[PDB]
Design a protein around this ligand. Structure first.
Ligand SMILES: Cn1nc([C@H]2CCC(=O)NC2=O)c2ccc(NC3CCNCC3)cc21
Ligand SMILES: [Zn+2]
Lengths: 373, 808
């Protein structure tokens, strides 16, 4: 009975924001140089939101200059954290901006979203403490239906289907009629359906439906690209898998890879332990429109990712309920640490007094988690 | 760096268009047939069809029509290609010369837009006032019909309906009127519009919108005096004329789906209807006269005329003679009789025309033991399936009917027999089981057997596929043996070879276990049969976890592809398979080819991998790779460094391994070197030749397509490649094509998202046609030509072209 549109707005950082409307799509495959934030260790996927609080002179000056020219910058996914190198990154367009003063220090609140991918082709250090990377925009490839190339017309009047009823028989009929021309080739129908966008999307949704039972068809997007990006954003994997899914350039290949990852992963454990059952796949469940995983920012300055679950083991709780800058409006929270490693893992949340809602909530950070496929 | 050469040995046979009318003269009844890129023109006479003309177009013919503007002695032909080249042509004959005059031409492509799923649609006003086209969703293009439109300039109009199932014009309307059936969330509806050329817009049509069946697909524009339109769907036939509305549901139609129609009488009193299962119906329209008013409809009837080949287009010629153009089988010319035979069919077969396509697999052998090869192909589908033997004599073709769908074929000299994989359609029974629909080769084998392994331990009216392995003699082409596979099983690959020290020759078959609930296979088999003394034995079998997508004999061992894995088995002395080497990749190895110690792996997404086998270590090391999202049909190996493949949009591409690279990064990348627009959907590649065994060409690869076309590809040298390129440029400059289409644009690599000029491929058809021209044009072409150096007179070119043509 908890609203799912509340945490998405990030009301904690602020209520009134200077929203900016307008879009600027960079031409594909072009070469352009854009500034890069100095301290960012998060891999950003297109269509995901990102807040940020900044208080550094050079970074604040960069944002102030940028907020009037195009409102776009770049984020680099670091293959290795120690050595700052990267081959792929994501363009980010800012859609929010606010300023605050704290007795003599300027603080900037920014909200942006990923737009496009790219392969870094050069980077340089400007004489201001920041970096500027020149990169070529990667392409987004969409392929036509596999059966369109087989023939020209044949029976085109039968290629359009009646509206899907609000299903097994319907899917069987869809496969049987859509790929009827498959008999003119050397491969059966199911082989072609294995590379069909709609069937892959339906399989993905069926797999996910266990986690959320109130999921609505409108809840997930319809276009293959948007669906693929959304699914890739909200999966509990390590950074290598995210980079792999980022490298893929075709929607079909990304969907197949995501389905493989979903069917492979079984459970998650403490990164420091490397063997400690903390949670399984079934336990995953979302409480926000974006999904189980989303971006947030600590008022201290560090931005931590967190998910939503209802069960934890091998955890030691520490602290008492508090509410000063909590991301969701109304909730308690206490720190948790690894029972063996003693390392901080996540935060245990207790619902608020108003009405009633899930009393025990576990929100962890992927930084201290690792699957056990 | 390719220097290749591609030519056509057999012209396409599948017919995709047919029309009838007075084209060559005001009083001659003409039949026009469009087979992919070929146009044929016959004059219908009492005895049959007399061929008159035949030409080729630089494109795929998607729309064809005949129309007679006011003040024209004869008709004019409007043609549109798959690349949106449109033209209007006329038939000109002076004495003994025949040629088609390009009255007008142009291109009607759009800068942006997603092509409609239902495909290109083209119609003409019955008054001959304009041409309507539907190419991209949400738009409707109109071309005015005026004598001053030699450029064919059209304009677009917006349609608020996105998914338009079908569209047609209407008869007997003062202003151009279009009736069309479309779909939306509520269902399917039919609506009418009036086209305003002066304002270039739409106006409310004669009668308002109405709701139709949930499967309406066919729109027929009845002529005067009836008017109105007829909507044909899955289970009902209706007639709308505004206020007047009639409907009937003939039960004898529920079995199949009407897909073709044609008009018999000029006043629309009868029609011919053709379904998916080779059936032919005759639809009748009764007429009633009331007082002194225009006659009206009274009722509708459908009568089952009979059975023919699976029909793609129908045309009534005269005296109850009908042409049935088909794509899955031979075209037919049949007759209709007033009475009925004992069986009850009114159709009497008269004449047939061969149709090799579709080609799903082939092999090259030498039955006569001479040096001259022969080609054996698996042609057709469903009750049209058969084997085709092609040998050079024009090509000599022999047909062996099967009455089911063949899928694979291989040859085994020692036993003197062919092994064929096949499938037939069976219907579930009331008691639970399967019943065949007709006699077939699978059920008429002299000896029969059923696989019995037990290694793994529905509804009514559903359809299932039964797979079979057929052993066929090589002299009489009679089914020696038949073997049936387990229920729910699928056959994918077939080979015949010898393994290890075993001197016998086996058939090795790969099969998958598929279930409707599961989306991907999880269990399959490799079966080793031996056929001796006229009986087939299950020598051995191995169960794998996956689906064997291919197999190739690899220097005494067996190479198999299981899901996304490559495995190499050996053949011990105990008559069994023992896994020897393994390799894991990230793609499904659908295509597998071998050459010495190199293995080429290909996926349906046009991902290419090149691996090698390490004899000293017995393990696989990856050598090279290449990834580019696109659809791929087939792959082949030309030599140690070149690879060939067929790509979406009917394209050919050639990649090369960059062995001259300095660093590992370049050494591990495959550079693309050749692009070409074939215009056909290549289905199979093979090594061999049809001519009896210093030459200007090395090697030869044959390829078979879906339209029944057969092509040949060979290599060349730099000097010859340059010479041929110059010759082709000159010939394109000199000769003229029907429809005034630029040849280079025709052979441009098209992908619906990017276009590049063809490189590395020398078109052979143009060079071959080089010989049909008169001497003065040859002199013009050869003028200022440097050939080994000298003035390079036309005699040298003629000799070289003859040398090239000799290869086939
Ligand atoms: C370390 N840390 N972490 C958090 C997380 C907890 C969960 C949440 O919902 N959001 C968070 O921000 C947090 C919130 C507030 C303070 N406040 C201190 C510094 C400013 N002066 C007052 C004391 C520290 C905090
Ligand atoms: Zn631990």
């Amino acid at each position: 009975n908890f609203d799912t549109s509340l945490p998405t707005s990030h009301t904690y950082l602020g209520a009134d924001m200077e929203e900016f409307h307008g879009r600027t799509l960079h031409d594909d495959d072009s070469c352009q140089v854009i500034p890069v934030l100095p301290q960012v260790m998060m891999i950003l996927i297109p269509g995901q939101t990102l807040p940020l609080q900044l208080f550094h002179p050079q970074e604040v000056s960069m944002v102030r200059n940028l907020i009037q020219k195009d409102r776009t910058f770049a984020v680099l996914a670091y293959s290795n954290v120690q050595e700052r190198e990267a081959q792929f990154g994501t363009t980010a367009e800012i859609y929010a901006y606010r300023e605050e003063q704290d007795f003599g220090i300027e603080i900037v609140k920014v909200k942006a979203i990923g737009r496009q991918r790219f392969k870094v082709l050069e980077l340089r250090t400007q004489s201001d403490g920041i970096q500027q990377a020149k990169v070529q925009i990667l392409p987004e490839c969409v392929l036509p239906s596999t059966m369109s190339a087989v023939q020209l017309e044949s029976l085109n009047k039968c290629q359009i289907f009646p509206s899907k009823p609000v299903s097994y028989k319907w899917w069987q009929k869809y496969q049987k009629r859509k790929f009827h021309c498959a008999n003119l080739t050397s491969w059966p129908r199911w082989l072609y359906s294995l590379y069909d966008a709609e069937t892959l999307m339906d399989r993905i949704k069926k797999q996910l439906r266990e986690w959320d039972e109130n999921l609505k068809d409108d809840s997930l997007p319809s276009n293959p690209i948007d669906f693929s990006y959304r699914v890739a954003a909200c999966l509990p994997i390590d950074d290598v898998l995210r980079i792999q899914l980022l490298k893929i350039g075709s929607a079909i290949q990304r969907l197949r890879c995501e389905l493989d990852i979903m069917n492979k992963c079984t459970s998650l454990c403490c990164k420091q332990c490397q063997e400690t059952e903390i949670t399984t796949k079934n336990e995953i469940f979302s409480l926000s429109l974006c999904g189980p995983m989303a971006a947030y920012v600590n008022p201290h300055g560090y931005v931590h990712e967190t998910l939503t679950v209802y069960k934890a083991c091998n955890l030691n709780l520490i602290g008492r309920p508090s509410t000063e800058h909590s991301w969701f409006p109304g909730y308690a929270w206490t720190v948790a640490q690894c029972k063996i490693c003693a390392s901080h893992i996540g935060w245990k949340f207790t619902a608020t007094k108003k009405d009633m809602s899930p009393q025990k909530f576990w929100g962890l950070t992927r930084s201290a988690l690792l699957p056990t496929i | 760096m390719s220097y290749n050469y591609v030519v056509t040995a057999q012209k396409p046979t599948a017919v995709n268009g047919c029309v009838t009318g007075h084209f060559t003269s005001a009083e001659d009844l003409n039949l026009l047939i469009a087979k992919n890129t070929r146009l044929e023109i016959y004059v219908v006479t009492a005895e049959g069809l007399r061929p008159v003309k035949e030409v080729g177009m630089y494109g795929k013919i998607a729309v064809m029509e005949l129309f007679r503007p006011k003040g024209e002695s004869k008709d004019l032909l409007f043609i549109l290609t798959a690349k949106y080249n449109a033209c209007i042509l006329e038939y000109k004959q002076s004495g003994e010369s025949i040629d088609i005059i390009t009255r007008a031409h142009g291109n009607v492509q759009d800068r942006i837009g997603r092509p409609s799923e239902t495909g290109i649609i083209g119609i003409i006003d019955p008054e001959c006032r304009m041409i309507g086209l539907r190419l991209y969703d949400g738009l409707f293009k109109v071309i005015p019909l005026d004598r001053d439109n030699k450029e064919l300039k059209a304009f677009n109009i917006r349609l608020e309906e996105l998914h338009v199932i079908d569209v047609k014009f209407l008869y007997g309307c003062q202003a151009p009127t279009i009736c069309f059936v479309y779909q939306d969330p509520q269902g399917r509806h039919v609506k009418t519009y009036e086209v305003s050329l002066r304002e270039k817009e739409f106006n409310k049509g004669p009668w308002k919108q109405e709701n139709v069946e949930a499967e309406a697909s066919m729109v027929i524009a009845v002529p005067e005096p009836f008017g109105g339109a007829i909507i044909i769907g899955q289970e009902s036939i209706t007639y709308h004329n505004g206020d007047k509305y009639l409907a009937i549901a003939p039960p004898i139609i529920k079995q199949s789906t009407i897909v073709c129609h044609n008009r018999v009488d000029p006043n629309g009193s009868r029609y011919l209807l053709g379904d998916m299962e080779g059936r032919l119906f005759m639809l009748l329209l009764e007429k009633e006269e009331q007082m002194d008013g225009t006659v009206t409809l009274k009722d509708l009837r459908v009568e089952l005329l009979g059975e023919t080949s699976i029909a793609e287009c129908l045309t009534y010629l005269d005296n109850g003679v009908v042409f049935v153009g088909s794509r899955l089988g031979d075209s037919q010319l049949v007759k209709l009789n007033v009475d009925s035979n004992e069986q009850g069919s009114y159709v009497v077969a008269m004449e047939t025309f061969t149709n090799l396509g579709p080609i799903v697999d082939m092999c090259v052998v030498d039955l006569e033991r001479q040096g001259q090869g022969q080609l054996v192909t698996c042609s057709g589908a469903f009750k049209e399936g058969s084997l085709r033997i092609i040998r050079n004599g024009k090509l000599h073709i022999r047909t062996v009917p099967l009455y089911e769908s063949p899928r694979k074929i291989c040859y085994q000299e020692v036993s003197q027999c062919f092994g064929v994989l096949s499938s037939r359609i069976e219907v579930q029974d009331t008691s639970g089981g399967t019943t065949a629909l007709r006699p077939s080769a699978s059920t008429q084998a002299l000896s029969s057997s059923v696989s019995s392994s037990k290694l793994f331990s529905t509804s009514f009216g559903e359809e299932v596929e039964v797979h079979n392995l057929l052993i066929i003699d090589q002299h009489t082409f009679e089914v020696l043996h038949a073997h049936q596979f387990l229920q729910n099983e699928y056959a994918l690959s077939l080979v015949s070879c010898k393994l290890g020290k075993d001197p016998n020759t086996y058939f090795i078959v790969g099969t998958a276990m598929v279930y409707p609930e599961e989306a991907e296979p999880k269990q399959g088999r490799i079966v080793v049969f031996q056929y001796s003394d006229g009986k087939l034995q299950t020598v051995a079998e191995k169960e794998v976890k996956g689906a064997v997508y291919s197999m190739v004999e690899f220097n005494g061992k067996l190479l198999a592809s299981i899901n996304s894995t490559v495995r190499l088995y050996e053949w011990t002395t105990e008559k069994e398979l023992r896994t020897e080497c393994n390799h894991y990749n990230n793609i499904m190895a659908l295509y597998l080819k071998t050459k010495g110690d190199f293995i080429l792996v290909g996926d349906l997404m046009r991902s290419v991998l090149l691996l090698a086998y390490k004899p000293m270590e017995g393990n696989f090391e990856e050598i090279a790779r290449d990834f580019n999202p696109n659809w791929m049909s087939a792959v082949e190996i030309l030599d140690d460094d070149n690879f060939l493949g067929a790509e979406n949009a009917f394209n050919l591409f050639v990649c090369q391994k960059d062995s001259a690279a300095t660093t590992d990064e370049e050494r591990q990348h495959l550079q693309e070197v050749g692009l070409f627009h074939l215009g056909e959907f290549v289905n199979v590649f093979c090594h061999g030749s049809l001519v009896m065994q210093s030459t200007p060409t090395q090697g030869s690869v044959l390829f078979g397509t879906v339209n029944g076309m057969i092509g040949l590809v060979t290599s060349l040298s730099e000097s010859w490649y340059n010479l041929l390129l110059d010759m082709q440029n000159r010939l394109n400059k000199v000769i003229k094509s029907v429809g005034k289409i630029e040849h280079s644009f025709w052979r441009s690599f098209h992908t619906e998202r990017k276009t590049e000029p063809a490189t590395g491929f020398i078109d052979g058809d143009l060079i071959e046609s080089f010989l049909d021209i008169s001497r003065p044009k040859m002199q013009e072409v050869v003028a200022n030509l440097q050939y080994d150096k000298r003035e390079a007179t036309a005699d040298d070119l003629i000799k070289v072209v003859e040398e090239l043509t000799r290869i086939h």
